[PDB]
């Protein structure tokens, strides 16, 4: 199928507590496979998925050098941002970055990503055409004019169209089924009486991968959207995910309700009942 590779950088200034902290995590699809933390005892990129542990020490050494240079770059960006917003050196601030590439089953680029947030809000992002910028405010427009005059979007375009796609292609090769195969949810319905005339039907999906999924409750074939309680999809901690949807039903009418489950690992959606 289609695949993506993404890096997620977080830099956090700590006024009067040292230099800013830099953390990175790397993902293929929904599978985290590397990390770096500047606050570790000997900061070094480290494996987090089984298929990447095969890489030789030159891989980890090279990437460690890059993260350290990135962390120093972010420090300077944070100092500029503080000036753009007339903030004090005494305030802690956050710079987040995410970039990477989506490819189709043919392996060639489908979409590139390259974006930033400052203190939790959108700041500037590269547009899908990989040639123009969307700035969130007037401060981000200082950055936008800088990057246009230097024609740096052409550089970004080349990394996303080139090297990004080649690393993804190689990581998909190492991973084999651990990255290609979708794991369908294990599903069931539980039943929790509230009182006379009311009980909760909870529809569960467990152990699924990737994280995208849809759970809906229907009454006699018609959606119950404004009355269904959903929880956010949550990690199980073994690289699979969980979700549930619940609805309150008139007691004795439990068998009017169906739960529908859509997921990449299910050719046909599932229809579930309490019975």
């Amino acid at each position: 199928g289609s695949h993506s590779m993404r890096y997620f950088y977080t830099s956090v200034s700590r006024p009067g507590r040292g230099e800013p902290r830099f953390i990175s995590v790397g993902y293929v699809d929904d599978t985290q496979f590397v990390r770096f933390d500047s606050d570790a005892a000997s900061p070094r990129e480290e494996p987090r998925a089984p298929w990447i542990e095969q890489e030789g020490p030159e891989y980890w050494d090279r990437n460690t050098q890059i993260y350290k240079a990135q962390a120093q770059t972010d420090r300077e960006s944070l100092r500029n941002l503080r000036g753009y917003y007339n903030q004090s050196e005494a305030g802690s601030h956050t710079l987040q970055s995410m970039y990477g590439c989506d490819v189709g089953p043919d392996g060639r680029l489908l979409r590139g990503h390259d974006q930033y947030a400052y203190d939790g809000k959108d700041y500037i992002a590269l547009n899908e055409d990989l040639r123009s910028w969307t700035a969130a405010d007037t401060a981000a427009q200082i950055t936008q004019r800088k990057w246009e005059a230097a024609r740096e979007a052409e550089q970004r375009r080349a990394y996303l169209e080139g090297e990004c796609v080649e690393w993804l292609r190689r990581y998909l090769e190492n991973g084999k089924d651990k990255l290609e195969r979708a794991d369908p949810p294990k599903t069931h319905v539980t039943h929790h009486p509230i009182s006379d005339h009311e009980a909760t039907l909870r529809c569960w999906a467990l152990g699924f991968y990737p994280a995208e999924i849809t759970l809906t409750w229907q009454r006699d074939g018609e959606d119950q959207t404004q009355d269904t309680e959903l929880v956010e999809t949550r990690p199980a901690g073994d690289r699979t995910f969980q979700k549930w949807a619940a609805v309150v039903v008139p007691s004795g009418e439990e068998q009017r309700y169906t739960c529908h489950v859509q997921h990449e690992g299910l050719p046909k959606p599932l229809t579930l009942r309490w019975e």
Partner: peptide, 9 residues
């Protein structure tokens, strides 16, 4: 692998 080009905001 992480990219090795760097950009100041």
């Amino acid at each position: 692998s992480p990219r090795w080009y760097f950009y100041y905001l």
